[PDB]
């Protein structure tokens, strides 16, 4: 029985406005035990992390973006939209060992660290395969690294994480029996495995770092995977 963490589908904003997002959790109060992160994507499948921790603003980002918790929910305030803020917001909650993503809302404005993933993987129906994440820029050891699905209309799932200086790993529930998350120390890279590939497995998939408290700063460019005869 997973929590269902909801978004408001759809906002629209003009330049020079304030706007308000908000992330409901399906099981009570969004609290700062959820430790509320905020992530846009941008077109091109681009993600950056603006929030964690409920209200904690990651290094340039700019200032207009803000998290608070506002009517036991996670709010993300943009005061001042400009044009290239129109994208897709997406929140996640912690709960107690896994990361549950809302829905996403799309905004509409009227008017150094890398994560190198490979592009894309063509693979047939049943197969396996074994996606990579390259961290260059920073110490992989120092922070975790996630793993995300994302097939279109369908919003970020949550696969898991890995601690990459032990080892450990933490699931969804959805992909305990399906993900296998594995780090080599000497080249600082992420590796995740799948078997018994089918066209429910076809999305893109994201790398992204994490430092416990902080947020999902840096992500991946995503490997699309595409299982296709």
């Known amino acids: 029985s997973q929590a269902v963490v909801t978004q408001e589908s759809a906002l629209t904003t003009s330049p020079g406005e304030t706007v308000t997002l908000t992330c409901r959790s399906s099981?009570?109060?969004?609290?700062?035990?959820?430790?509320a992160n905020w992530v846009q994507e941008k077109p091109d499948h681009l993600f950056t992390g603006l929030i964690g921790g409920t209200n904690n603003r990651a290094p340039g980002v700019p200032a207009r973006f803000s998290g608070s918790l506002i009517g036991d929910k996670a709010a993300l305030t943009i005061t001042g939209a400009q044009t290239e803020d129109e994208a897709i917001y997406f929140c996640?909650?912690?709960?107690?060992?896994?990361?549950?993503f809302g829905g996403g809302t799309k905004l509409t404005v009227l008017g150094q660290v890398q994560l190198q993933q490979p592009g894309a993987e063509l693979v047939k129906p049943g197969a396996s395969v074994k996606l990579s994440c390259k961290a260059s820029g920073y110490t992989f050891t120092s922070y975790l690294m996630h793993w995300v699905k994302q097939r279109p209309g369908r919003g970020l799932e949550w696969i898991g994480r890995?601690?990459?200086?032990?080892?450990?790993?933490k699931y969804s529930e959805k992909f305990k029996s399906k993900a296998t998350l594995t780090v080599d120390k000497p080249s600082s890279t992420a590796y995740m495995q799948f078997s018994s590939l089918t066209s429910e497995d076809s999305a893109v998939y994201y790398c992204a770092r994490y430092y416990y408290g902080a947020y999902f700063d840096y992500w991946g460019q995503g490997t699309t995977l595409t299982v296709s005869s």
């Open positions: 099981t009570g109060a969004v609290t700062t035990s959820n430790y």
């Open positions: 890995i601690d990459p200086n032990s080892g450990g790993t």
């Open positions: 996640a909650l912690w709960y107690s060992n896994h990361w549950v």
